[PDB]
Amino acid sequence: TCPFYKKIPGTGFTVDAFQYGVVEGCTAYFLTHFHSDHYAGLSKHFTFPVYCSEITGNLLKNKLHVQEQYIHPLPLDTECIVNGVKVVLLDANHCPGAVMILFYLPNGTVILHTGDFRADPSMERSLLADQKVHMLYLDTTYCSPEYTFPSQQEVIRFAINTAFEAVTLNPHALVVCGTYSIGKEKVFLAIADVLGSKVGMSQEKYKTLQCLNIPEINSLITTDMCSSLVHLLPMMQINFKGLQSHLKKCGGKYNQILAFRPTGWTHSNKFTRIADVIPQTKGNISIYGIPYSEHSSYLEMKRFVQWLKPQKIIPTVNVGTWKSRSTMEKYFREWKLEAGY
Ligand code: NI
């Protein structure tokens, strides 16, 4: 059964609620982004209206074979009417096609659902600036002060500089980047651009990337692995065994692997600066864990909420334990008392 925090009161609407069968009284199903925990249950046999971004709708059609007649893509930053209710989709600064949804209820209540997001000060000048929000359904993934990480820009600088140094020292080194879902494409695209290579990958991943409206993409990616010195592989294969095996497959073109695993947070964030990050090495294979996050840090989250000043917060992440729930409620109260709303 669908949990309360996926239901929008006063509407016939649910958000990211595809794994519960037919939800009683739901006339339109919203999908914030194409990540498996959120789309779980969608397929070609789904026959209710799905509302989402253009990019999410490309993935629905091509990857999950959802029929076109049930996909309703909406433009961003545009007031739209759905089953008699005004809605707006906003960029969520998560993975490609990820949105936040503003709902303007018939009784005058305004609700913001963040989906998954990385809060940014740029959001303070979207259509959010123009009215009050009563209820906030918040991505609380990293809602504790131990969760610090660098900007995305500093992380990409580290990766570009690392890869360029390595391959300039040894022109026979291969760079490998791990992936298991959409998001974080900047990691591998930035490295390929500094090395003047295309990124090589499986046909299934190439298909996924061709759905994302990334400009000049035919220029940056390929399925011809032999022509590329940046290869993408499944995240599970980013280990010394899986990388030794891959190196064998390249037929003596290469004699070294430098590999990147973009994680969210790891506890080496509490001690080490990005400048100071070092790899795990075995023989001619080095593996770097880099803290590239597409969720809010604690401080980014706090600033957004203290700016927005909602009357009520509903967490959508870490809601399964009493200890988590109590911790989050304590922070929301601190934030409110410090800011004075
Ligand atoms: Ni996500």
Curated annotation (Swiss-Prot):
Expressed in brain, heart, kidney, liver, pancreas, placenta and skeletal muscle. One of its GO terms (molecular function) is damaged DNA binding. It comes from the Eukaryota. One of its GO terms (biological process) is double-strand break repair via nonhomologous end joining. It is found in: Nucleus. Binds constitutively to TP53BP1. Binds CDC27, which is itself a component of the anaphase promoting complex (APC). Binds PIAS1. Induction: During mitosis. The mRNA encoding this protein contains an internal ribosome entry site (IRES) in its 5'-UTR. This 5'-UTR generally suppresses translation while specifically promoting expression during mitosis, when cap-dependent translation may be impaired. The keyword Disulfide bond does not apply. This is DNA cross-link repair 1A protein. The gene is DCLRE1A. May be required for DNA interstrand cross-link repair. Also required for checkpoint mediated cell cycle arrest in early prophase in response to mitotic spindle poisons. Possesses beta-lactamase activity, catalyzing the hydrolysis of penicillin G and nitrocefin. Exhibits no activity towards other beta-lactam antibiotic classes including cephalosporins (cefotaxime) and carbapenems (imipenem). Keywords: Cell cycle, Cell division, DNA damage, DNA repair, Hydrolase, Isopeptide bond, Metal-binding, Mitosis, Nucleus, Phosphoprotein, Ubl conjugation, Zinc, Zinc-finger. GO terms for cellular component: fibrillar center; nucleoplasm. Belongs to the DNA repair metallo-beta-lactamase (DRMBL) family.
